[PDB]
Amino acid sequence: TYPFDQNRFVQYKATSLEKQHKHDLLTEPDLGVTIDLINPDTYRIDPNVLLDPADEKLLEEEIQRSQQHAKVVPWMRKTEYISTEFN
């Protein structure tokens, strides 16, 4: 048996997973927001007031071109059409 080092993989060294990892957003289930029942002011509902522009953008429902015709291609040509006057 070849005498491999007994702690060749124990020693810390740069790894691919070190730079390829991804960080995640972890927060409390309610996410720093609670129902402010204490204040009736927040309980008031005002439909007359205009909606914020960002809020309108969010309301848009989500549903789940070739530039070849315009390529120059020098050799090709165009096509004229019947005109009442011609030489």
Binding site: Y12, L17, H21, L25, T27, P29, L31, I38, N39, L58
Partner: protein, 470 residues
Amino acid sequence: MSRGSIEIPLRDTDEVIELDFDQLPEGDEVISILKQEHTQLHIWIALALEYYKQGKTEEFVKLLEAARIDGNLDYRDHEKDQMTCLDTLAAYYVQQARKEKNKDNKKDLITQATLLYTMADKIIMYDQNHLLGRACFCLLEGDKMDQADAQFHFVLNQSPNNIPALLGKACISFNKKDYRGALAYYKKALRTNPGCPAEVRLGMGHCFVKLNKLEKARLAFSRALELNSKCVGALVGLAVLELNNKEADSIKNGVQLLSRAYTIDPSNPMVLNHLANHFFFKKDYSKVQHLALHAFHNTEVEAMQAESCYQLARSFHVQEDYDQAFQYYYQATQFASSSFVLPFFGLGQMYIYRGDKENASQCFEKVLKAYPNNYETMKILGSLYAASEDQEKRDIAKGHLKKVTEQYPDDVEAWIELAQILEQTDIQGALSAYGTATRILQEKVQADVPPEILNNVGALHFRLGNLGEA
């Protein structure tokens, strides 16, 4: 805009006491005035809400405890005032219990909160305000979350344009990982009332990341940053996004923003984790341990401890404290997210060091199942399974080692490891692998072959029949 003047009917006198909000005296005098006046409960609620708005909860707390006993309910609308006054204090206890970071304090406040919430149920339960308050109280614990779901659901049924009930349903939708309903309820809840603390809008930004709308999340964070600079969650999300950008300048500016947020609120666990990961590279491992330990103790949720512990364990791996690194790597893996696998890598290394080859392979197998293309884990897994008594694993070790050798033309140890298992059934393959290893040793390493490789090559030749080469 005038704040307004509170009017109180004086006992047996037509004159009414008028007090403007701006110059309202201390609540200690107001409580005695009301007690000697025997006024209606709605005046107490108005004064209670005024001192709550002033930012002093102690004044509001004191007048509400004193009011609930000596109230005057000799009028038509006494029941509604009584319900609101009791429920306000009960729900404030729940909110204050949530605010504190000590579990013991939570239970002490929760005790009186439960007593007072049961009392409110005694008189009237169908009241919408009482229903939402009970939903919040039951949501706080977390074991009564389904009751909050049902309560917010039928409260929402009562009124569609109702931000608090819809907000609770959206929060519960987030908790149960119902992403579409959560997003829909949040959008509609924000529509109901544009006037609301910016915290609700923070829930939008993160939801966009939950839907992978990174540019949308960036825009949401920018709008959050513009409107309110005191939102720690928004800064944390922006810093996390910059971290996820994976760019040196992005990391540097994200760390500065993380420091600013930690200065704003050092008690938040998540913010500290991102900046401590940078500290690891700064070589100030003592500060790394401090920040990692600080974040791990501060939080109360299990998902958070996935990161901090890892970093600490990682920090402990370069301090050669393999036993404590082992234990803390195990803690990080025990409370881990599917998105995080590095703790399993570190835990496999610790198990490898301790001699727990089988469980180390299990951790590495988990990492491989999560991420099957990593080269480092592939090499380690190939080596570890090569020295396996079971025959079936030798083929997998061969495959891993073959995969490693193809990806890496120059890996003497991988070639030797592959050869040591090709010997069992593939004499020519083992000979080819040993020859390749010898070629790299002579070419790059520029060292004479080890005697063991020469002996094994000769033994393979003997098995083949090349006695002269043997």
